[PDB]
Amino acid sequence: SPGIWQLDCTHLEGKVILVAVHVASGYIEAEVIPAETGQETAYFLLKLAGRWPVKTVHTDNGSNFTSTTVKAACWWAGIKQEDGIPYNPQSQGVIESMNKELKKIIGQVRDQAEHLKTAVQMAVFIHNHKRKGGYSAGERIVDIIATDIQT
Amino acid sequence: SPGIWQLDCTHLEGKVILVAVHVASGYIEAEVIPAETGQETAYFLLKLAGRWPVKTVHTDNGSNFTSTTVKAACWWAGIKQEDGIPYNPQSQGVIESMNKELKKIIGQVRDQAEHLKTAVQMAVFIHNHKRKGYSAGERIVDIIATDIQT
Ligand SMILES: O=C(O)c1cccc2ccoc12
Numbered sequence: 240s241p242g243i244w245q246l247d248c249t250h251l252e253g254k255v256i257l258v259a260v261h262v263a264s265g266y267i268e269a270e271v272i273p274a275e276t277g278q279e280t281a282y283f284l285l286k287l288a289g290r291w292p293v294k295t296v297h298t299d300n301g302s303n304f305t306s307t308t309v310k311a312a313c314w315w316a317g318i319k320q321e322d323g324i325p326y327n328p329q330s331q332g333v334i335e336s337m338n339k340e341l342k343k344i345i346g347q348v349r350d351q352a353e354h355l356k357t358a359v360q361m362a363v364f365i366h367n368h369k370r371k372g373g374y375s376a377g378e379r380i381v382d383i384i385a386t387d388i389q390t
Numbered sequence: 391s392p393g394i395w396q397l398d399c400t401h402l403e404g405k406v407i408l409v410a411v412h413v414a415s416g417y418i419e420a421e422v423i424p425a426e427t428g429q430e431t432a433y434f435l436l437k438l439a440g441r442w443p444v445k446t447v448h449t450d451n452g453s454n455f456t457s458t459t460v461k462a463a464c465w466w467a468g469i470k471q472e473d474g475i476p477y478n479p480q481s482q483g484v485i486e487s488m489n490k491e492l493k494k495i496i497g498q499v500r501d502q503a504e505h506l507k508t509a510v511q512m513a514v515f516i517h518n519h520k521r522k523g524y525s526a527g528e529r530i531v532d533i534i535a536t537d538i539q540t
Pocket residue numbers: 367368375376377378381439440441442443534538
């Protein structure tokens with residue numbers, strides 16, 4: 240479904256990496272923050288929704304589901320906030336594996352980057368460009384949404 | 391072409407807004423930074439090229455064109471760096487008008503945001519969703535989707 244994203248928060252080097260995954264394509268955006276607060280999560284979702292047509296977000300935990308700053312940004316940006324409960328459980332494993340994959344890439348580039356934030360963005364780039372066509376996630380998200388626009 | 395972006399740096403509230411415009415669609419990504427440096431520009435290009443299929447960037451000035459750090463990020467991300475000289479001169483007035491438009495949006499949301507960086511991101515959202523009949527966000531997806539199919 241073209242508008243559905245999942246939030247995912249993972250830890251590395253005593254810092255937090257906030258990830259949004261476009262569930263249908265596997266495409267991601269990510270940022271490093273010093274910790275997951277509502278204010279950070281709200282800003283991150285605002286950035287995401289100005290860049291892709293975000294209709295539904297599965298939030299990553301109940302604090303962010305509850306957070307009034309996150310609810311304000313979802314209201315502002317037109318995003319329906321949902322809980323992120325894996326009523327389908329293969330769903331949990333998909334995210335865990337991506338966190339493992341991302342950290343692996345971060346490790347592979349870590350020495351090319353002075354700051355963790357550069358390595359995370361190199362990781363976003365390699366993730367989004369990897370051919371799986373085969374098509375990449377970046378190709379899949381564009382195809383999904385462009386098919387959707389023809390409606 | 392689907393892969394061509396232009397960098398654009400504008401100032402407001404004694405801060406700098408770095409903008410990348412996807413030239414064919416008008417779609418933008420922007421960030422606030424304390425000053426335009428090679429390091430900031432390099433990191434911004436790295437983020438953009440992980441998000442969209444960036445093939446050529448028209449750099450905004452000669453310092454960023456020259457910058458070793460920007461050249462390094464362009465190398466890493468597979469981006470051809472080009473100067474941004476207005477070869478067709480209508481190019482130029484297009485950017486100035488966009489900067490004026492953005493700043494207008496920023497003023498209209500400014501009071502809903504405590505920090506300039508929130509207002510800038512609200513402005514990117516309004517800019518990219520505005521219908522002109524398709525929005526810039528729809529145009530960039532259609533352009534690149536058409537591209538992928540060949
Ligand atoms: O390869 C593509 O067409 C593509 C489309 C949209 C986003 C990204 C990020 C890396 O590649 C892409």
